[PDB]
Amino acid sequence: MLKKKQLTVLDLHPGAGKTRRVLPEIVREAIKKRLRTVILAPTRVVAAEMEEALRGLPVRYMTTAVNVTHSGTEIVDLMCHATFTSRLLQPIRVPNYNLNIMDEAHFTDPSSIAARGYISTRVEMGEAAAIFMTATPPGTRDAFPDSNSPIMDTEVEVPERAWSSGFDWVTDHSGKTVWFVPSVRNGNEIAACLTKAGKRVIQLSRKTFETEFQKTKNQEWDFVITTDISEMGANFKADRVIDSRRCLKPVILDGERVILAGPMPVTHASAAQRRGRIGRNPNKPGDEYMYGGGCAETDEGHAHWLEARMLLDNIYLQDGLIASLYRPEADKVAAIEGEFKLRTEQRKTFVELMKRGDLPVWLAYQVASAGITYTDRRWCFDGTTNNTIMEDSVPAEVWTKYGEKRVLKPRWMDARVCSDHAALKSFKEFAAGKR
Numbered sequence: 521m522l523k524k525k526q527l528t529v530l531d532l533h534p535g536a537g538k539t540r541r542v543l544p545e546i547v548r549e550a551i552k553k554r555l556r557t558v559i560l561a562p563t564r565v566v567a568a569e570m571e572e573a574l575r576g577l578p579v580r581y582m583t584t585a586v587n588v589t590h591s592g593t594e595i596v597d598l599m600c601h602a603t604f605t606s607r608l609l610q611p612i613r614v615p616n617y618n619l620n621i622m623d624e625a626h627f628t629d630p631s632s633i634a635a636r637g638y639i640s641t642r643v644e645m646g647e648a649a650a651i652f653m654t655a656t657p658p659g660t661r662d663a664f665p666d667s668n669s670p671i672m673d674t675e676v677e678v679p680e681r682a683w684s685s686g687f688d689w690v691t692d693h694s695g696k697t698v699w700f701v702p703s704v705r706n707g708n709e710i711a712a713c714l715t716k717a718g719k720r721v722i723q724l725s726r727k728t729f730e731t732e733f734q735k736t737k738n739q740e741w742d743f744v745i746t747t748d749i750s751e752m753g754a755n756f757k758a759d760r761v762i763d764s765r766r767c768l769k770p771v772i773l774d775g776e777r778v779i780l781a782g783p784m785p786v787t788h789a790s791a792a793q794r795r796g797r798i799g800r801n802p803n804k805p806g807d808e809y810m811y812g813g814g815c816a817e818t819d820e821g822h823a824h825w826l827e828a829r830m831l832l833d834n835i836y837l838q839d840g841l842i843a844s845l846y847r848p849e850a851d852k853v854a855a856i857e858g859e860f861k862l863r864t865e866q867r868k869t870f871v872e873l874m875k876r877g878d879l880p881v882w883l884a885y886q887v888a889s890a891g892i893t894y895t896d897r898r899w900c901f902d903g904t905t906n907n908t909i910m911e912d913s914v915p916a917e918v919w920t921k922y923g924e925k926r927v928l929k930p931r932w933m934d935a936r937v938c939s940d941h942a943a944l945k946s947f948k949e950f951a952a953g954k955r
């Protein structure tokens with residue numbers, strides 16, 4: 521498994537022990553063979569869990585999520601998927617790791633897809649070995665894989681709005697439920713309806729994940745309302761999963777704007793990962809999985825695969841060569857390899873708009889490729905009237921860095937900058953020149 525020129529997919533079912541049992545064995549063998557190794561965690565929460573399973577082993581934690589004193593002699597590095605891709609893009613020397621281990625390798629965020637493409641290209645070239653750890657490899661068609669204990673699967677209508685009647689089974693439950701919703705806004709409505717009925721609810725999403733996940737272990741709760749981020753190795757002490765079976769899909773229209781389409785069906789991989797939250801304790805059979813729709817291959821034409829190509833086109837590999845996407849997920853986008861390659865100055869602006877600007881990859885690319893510098897925000901206000909960003913049914917307004925009140929009307933409209941109150945707040949600060 522650790523021999524050069526080989527990519528292995530460790531596809532044990534959810535809860536089979538990939539992270540707590542297999543991962544330490546692989547690390548011990550890699551250190552014995554003196555292989556310079558990278559361990560890639562999807563989130564800071566998973567990085568903290570990996571430190572518990574690897575505790576004592578000489579691993580260098582390149583994250584502030586772990587408070588450890590490194591000896592300086594570690595040959596095994598651990599960092600998040602995004603950090604790896606970020607360091608590849610930046611003018612920082614990244615070691616040419618002999619062994620590349622990716623945990624939760626089904627993660628479909630652009631930086632995870634780009635990391636898989638880069639690593640799999642190095643393996644194809646015969647320069648490295650790689651191990652992708654996931655119960656649901658790219659292309660899986662089984663939404664009901666094996667579990668540690670039997671699960672009661674039930675197809676049922678699941679509410680996506682507040683309800684006054686017709687869903688007694690939801691509140692007539694004395695255990696703990698994890699509920700996957702298609703968006704932050706949809707979760708807010710269900711959480712308020714559940715709170716009004718006397719339930720204690722915790723809400724999780726990409727931006728609030730590390731802080732709010734702590735509350736699932738520090739306090740008593742009845743429901744966790746979460747977006748698709750909890751498919752990435754997040755574990756709960758629950759006995760029921762309610763799954764809407766729906767997600768939002770970013771879609772690029774005519775190469776000029778990004779909309780959040782749907783809600784629409786999740787992939788079979790996503791459904792299996794959501795269901796996989798329960799049935800994990802062999803001593804507690806009977807966990808329930810209630811699902812509200814079917815699965816579909818909605819990753820085809822999803823903006824994240826296009827954004828992954830924008831990232832890989834700007835990562836140095838060898839001379840003019842460019843890393844391809846990982847073969848099983850390469851048909852999800854119809855881009856020309858190298859079509860997003862930027863010149864040195866524009867590439868630096870592209871990186872900074874993502875790293876400091878916190879802009880989506882697609883939007884960062886439109887700005888940098890237009891020859892606009894990082895601190896130049898005139899583009900946030902000179903778009904067409906149909907690009908007006910709306911806040912509570914009235915045009916959003918900001919004071920520019922010049923002291924003038926202006927309506928937010930970006931030249932390129934990416935729906936992810938205003939998909940929720942928190943996102944629009946961060947975009948307003950960016951348009952105002954506050955970061």
Ligand SMILES: CC(=O)Nc1ccc2cn[nH]c2c1
Nearest residue numbers: 772775776826853854855856
């Ligand atoms: C993959 C493909 O269809 N090409 C494409 C799609 C959308 C955009 C937006 N900006 N550049 C683009 C290039």
